Amino acid sequence: MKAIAVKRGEDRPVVIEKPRPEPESGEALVRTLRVGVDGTDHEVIAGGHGGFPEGEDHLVLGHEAVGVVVDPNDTELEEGDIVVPTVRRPPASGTNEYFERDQPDMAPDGMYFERGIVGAHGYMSEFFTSPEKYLVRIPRSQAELGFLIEPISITEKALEHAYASRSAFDWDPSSAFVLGNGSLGLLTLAMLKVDDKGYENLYCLGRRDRPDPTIDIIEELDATYVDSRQTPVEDVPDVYEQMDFIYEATGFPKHAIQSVQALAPNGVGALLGVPSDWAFEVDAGAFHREMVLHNKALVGSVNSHVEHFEAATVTFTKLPKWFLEDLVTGVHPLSEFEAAFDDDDTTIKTAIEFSTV
Amino acid sequence: MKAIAVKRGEDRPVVIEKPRPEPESGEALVRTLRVGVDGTDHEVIAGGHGGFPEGEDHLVLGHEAVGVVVDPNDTELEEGDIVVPTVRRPPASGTNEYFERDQPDMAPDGMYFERGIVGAHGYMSEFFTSPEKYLVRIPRSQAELGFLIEPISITEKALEHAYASRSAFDWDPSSAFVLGNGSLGLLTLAMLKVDDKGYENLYCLGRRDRPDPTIDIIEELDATYVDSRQTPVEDVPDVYEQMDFIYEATGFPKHAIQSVQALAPNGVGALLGVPSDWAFEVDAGAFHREMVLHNKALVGSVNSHVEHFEAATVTFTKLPKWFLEDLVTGVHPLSEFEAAFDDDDTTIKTAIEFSTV
Numbered sequence: 001m002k003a004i005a006v007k008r009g010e011d012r013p014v015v016i017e018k019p020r021p022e023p024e025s026g027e028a029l030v031r032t033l034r035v036g037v038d039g040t041d042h043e044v045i046a047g048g049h050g051g052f053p054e055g056e057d058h059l060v061l062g063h064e065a066v067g068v069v070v071d072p073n074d075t076e077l078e079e080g081d082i083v084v085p086t087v088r089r090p091p092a093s094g095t096n097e098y099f100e101r102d103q104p105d106m107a108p109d110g111m112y113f114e115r116g117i118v119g120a121h122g123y124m125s126e127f128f129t130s131p132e133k134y135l136v137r138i139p140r141s142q143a144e145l146g147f148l149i150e151p152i153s154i155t156e157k158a159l160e161h162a163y164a165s166r167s168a169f170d171w172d173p174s175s176a177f178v179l180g181n182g183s184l185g186l187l188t189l190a191m192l193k194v195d196d197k198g199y200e201n202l203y204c205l206g207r208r209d210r211p212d213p214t215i216d217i218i219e220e221l222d223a224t225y226v227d228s229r230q231t232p233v234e235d236v237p238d239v240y241e242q243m244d245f246i247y248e249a250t251g252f253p254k255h256a257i258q259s260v261q262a263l264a265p266n267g268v269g270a271l272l273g274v275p276s277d278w279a280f281e282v283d284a285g286a287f288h289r290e291m292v293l294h295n296k297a298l299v300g301s302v303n304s305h306v307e308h309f310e311a312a313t314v315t316f317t318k319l320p321k322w323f324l325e326d327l328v329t330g331v332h333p334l335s336e337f338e339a340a341f342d343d344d345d346t347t348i349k350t351a352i353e354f355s356t357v
Numbered sequence: 358m359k360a361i362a363v364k365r366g367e368d369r370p371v372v373i374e375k376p377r378p379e380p381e382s383g384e385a386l387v388r389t390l391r392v393g394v395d396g397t398d399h400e401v402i403a404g405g406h407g408g409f410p411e412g413e414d415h416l417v418l419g420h421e422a423v424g425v426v427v428d429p430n431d432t433e434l435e436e437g438d439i440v441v442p443t444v445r446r447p448p449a450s451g452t453n454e455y456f457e458r459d460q461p462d463m464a465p466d467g468m469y470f471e472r473g474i475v476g477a478h479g480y481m482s483e484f485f486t487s488p489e490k491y492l493v494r495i496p497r498s499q500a501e502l503g504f505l506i507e508p509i510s511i512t513e514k515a516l517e518h519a520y521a522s523r524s525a526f527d528w529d530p531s532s533a534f535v536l537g538n539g540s541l542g543l544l545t546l547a548m549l550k551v552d553d554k555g556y557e558n559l560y561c562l563g564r565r566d567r568p569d570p571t572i573d574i575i576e577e578l579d580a581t582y583v584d585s586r587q588t589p590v591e592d593v594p595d596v597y598e599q600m601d602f603i604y605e606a607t608g609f610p611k612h613a614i615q616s617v618q619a620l621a622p623n624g625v626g627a628l629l630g631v632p633s634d635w636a637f638e639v640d641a642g643a644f645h646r647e648m649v650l651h652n653k654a655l656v657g658s659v660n661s662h663v664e665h666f667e668a669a670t671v672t673f674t675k676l677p678k679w680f681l682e683d684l685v686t687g688v689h690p691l692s693e694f695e696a697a698f699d700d701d702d703t704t705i706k707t708a709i710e711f712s713t714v
């Protein structure tokens with residue numbers, strides 16, 4: 001079968017050939033339909049995040065996948081089921097308490113692999129296998145955009161933890177601010193529009209000149225576009241308003257620290273970005289004082305698990321159809337796979353199509 | 358009646374004379390027994406925190422109080438009830454949603470007064486009044502050390518919020534690290550020893566040379582004393598271990614930021630300190646990366662309310678008797694009130710006695 005991989009020392013994705021895998025007991029064989037590309041994938045290709053499997057000269061890319069079950073083997077899945085795989089798997093040493101208690105998304109560094117990212121091959125191959133417990137059935141009509149279930153699930157987890165942090169008092173937020181206008185930030189903005197908490201005012205930070213299709217999406221959702229070159233995060237309360245909820249999806253470490261100044265009293269910031277190294281002079285006193293005197297919280301979140309994927313299938317149905325059309329700028333057949341890895345301003349969410357249902 | 362106050366421009370507490378107050382409808386008259394002194398009081402005297410009541414030349418000090426009801430007026434309290442007052446009261450403008458929903462501890466800057474601290478006279482007077490809703494009845498046998506109920510309640514709130522932040526997954530901590538060896542830090546250390554979460558290893562940060570009575574208390578509780586001059590917070594995981602729970606009670610802003618490096622994966626830091634201004638160069642990337650990739654949280658907390666005071670009466674009963682004896686280094690009659698404001702290394706928790714039951 002064909003697969004899309006990065007090779008050691010090499011800089012770009014290439015096609016390689018590999019044998020079709022065979023499922024072990026408890027595993028199904030899945031034929032890949034479509035696999036998305038996100039900012040983490042680009043960082044993996046560049047060497048900034050993740051790592052190769054032990055003793056392999058390559059890493060098959062891709063972690064946002066949807067496929068169709070072609071051999072259920074000895075599992076309770078059925079032929080033709082549409083499934084989305086979870087990303088984390090036990091490391092070489094074997095299972096541990098995080099996997100045993102069904103919370104691998106909470107496992108620390110060195111106690112997991114992530115398929116397509118660290119220590120294990122991803123899903124950009126014509127076929128893959130996985131244990132049934134890590135395959136989430138989704139409605140058949142979500143198959144075409146089913147690679148979106150994974151990134152939606154990321155936000156489902158982050159919101160669960162951020163909201164838990166505010167559960168000891170009566171918190172009623174009215175404003176939310178998403179930092180970043182990438183595919184995660186834009187998806188999250190749309191999710192916040194339909195969130196049960198009832199946000200009245202939505203804002204999204206970016207650094208683009210008009211005309212720009214990410215700006216168009218933000219404004220079409222009735223949110224306010226904030227240009228960080230004009231209005232830095234710490235200045236936002238003066239120009240706009242204090243934000244009850246902040247979701248950081250830039251990977252820029254200054255935003256992690258400055259978010260505390262933009263937060264309203266009793267607010268929470270959720271941090272999702274995978275950051276680069278960075279040092280600067282911070283007013284630590286201002287950070288400290290705001291956290292304490294105004295009962296603020298900062299919560300970091302990574303990965304997600306089955307319950308979050310399930311929740312994502314419900315959230316998907318609530319998202320506007322125009323939005324899903326505008327977000328996905330290109331779905332490319334395997335013959336033109338290279339195009340999926342373009343990263344210009346007019347490219348938002350891309351995917352590669354391996355096959356159709 | 359006599360009261361202990363700081364005067365505008367003046368630098369030390371002095372005795373002043375004031376009329377005995379008369380309770381309005383819904384208020385009781387309370388005869389003060391004992392009033393504690395903490396680090397926040399010292400900061401109030403020095404001008405670093407809080408502020409005077411509008412149009413007054415002085416501020417009566419004291420926020421940690423216990424008293425006996427001498428006139429229940431038209432309330433459901435009884436003559437001779439032992440009560441501890443809460444600290445926050447509505448501002449000049451009147452009630453707001455935080456007071457109406459019974460969560461004044463969540464009110465932001467400018468939407469509350471704190472008695473003895475900001476905008477309203479405290480409890481270091483022979484008598485005071487308060488609304489019944491802000492008077493918490495405590496067991497009569499806790500009267501002598503009843504000024505401890507307030508600081509215990511601070512920690513009851515902080516733990517409620519810190520633990521809420523970890524409630525979306527199965528969190529089982531084994532190690533806790535208290536930053537600071539003041540009266541709040543030491544009380545919190547003892548509370549963590551008896552906490553239901555079942556901490557196995559306790560640690561406390563200070564910067565004292567032996568012999569020192571705070572070090573003795575830490576070790577007598579079977580905790581490990583960590584000298585910040587030898588082992589800074591960020592280095593603690595290398596020398597000792599990563600900490601599941603951190604409680605910051607130093608008011609030093611470097612600790613607010615560096616705590617993230619000492620936290621174990623999935624851990625939380627609670628921030629309580631009232632900080633001074635401070636700026637330094639931080640590895641923001643390291644802060645950001647640890648928060649996200651290891652699902653960490655930071656929660657700030659201030660003040661407390663009735664439910665936390667109630668909980669404190671239960672926690673009080675569980676604290677070792679030797680500990681309460683060693684913590685309270687001096688209870689001073691009003692005739693020697695000045696001694697309560699000494700701040701040498703051998704002075705831990707002090708109080709002033711106005712009367713006895």
Ligand SMILES: NC(=O)c1ccc[n+]([C@@H]2O[C@H](COP(=O)([O-])OP(=O)(O)OC[C@H]3O[C@@H](n4cnc5c(N)ncnc54)[C@H](OP(=O)(O)O)[C@@H]3O)[C@@H](O)[C@H]2O)c1
Binds near residue numbers: 249250272301
């Ligand atoms: N925690 C998790 O489980 C998890 C899951 C998925 C993704 N992630 C991470 O989350 C982040 C977002 O993912 P993504 O796929 O949306 O990545 P992305 O496509 O790279 O989006 C990041 C966006 O942030 C913008 N940005 C960067 N610095 C900015 C600044 N200073 N001011 C305003 N905007 C700025 C960028 O704008 P420009 O294009 O103009 O530079 C870019 O569009 C990445 O760090 C990714 O690795 C984490």
Ligand SMILES: NC(=O)c1ccc[n+]([C@@H]2O[C@H](COP(=O)([O-])OP(=O)(O)OC[C@H]3O[C@@H](n4cnc5c(N)ncnc54)[C@H](OP(=O)(O)O)[C@@H]3O)[C@@H](O)[C@H]2O)c1
Binds near residue numbers: 539585607609628631
């Ligand atoms: N959030 C709230 O609702 C609330 C409630 C009560 C108190 N507070 C605040 O919480 C803090 C603690 O209260 P407290 O009454 O215990 O105050 P405290 O008596 O001043 O205790 C602070 C302790 O921290 C130690 N410390 C300062 N810097 C240190 C460092 N770099 N390394 C190691 N130890 C250091 C000090 O040691 P040394 O004596 O050796 O200098 C001191 O013993 C204060 O900031 C206070 O204002 C807040």
Ligand SMILES: OC[C@H]1O[C@@H](O)[C@H](O)[C@@H](O)[C@@H]1O
Binds near residue numbers: 038114117274303304
């Ligand atoms: O590698 C950190 C994170 O990167 C994201 O793009 C993936 O969606 C997550 O599953 C993963 O945990």
Ligand SMILES: OC[C@H]1O[C@@H](O)[C@H](O)[C@@H](O)[C@@H]1O
Binds near residue numbers: 398511631
């Ligand atoms: O002023 C901030 C805090 O200082 C503390 O000492 C008091 O115990 C709290 O009631 C108060 O909210």
Ligand SMILES: [Zn+2]
Binds near residue numbers: 038
């Ligand atoms: Zn991703």
Ligand SMILES: [Zn+2]
Binds near residue numbers: 397508
């Ligand atoms: Zn206090």
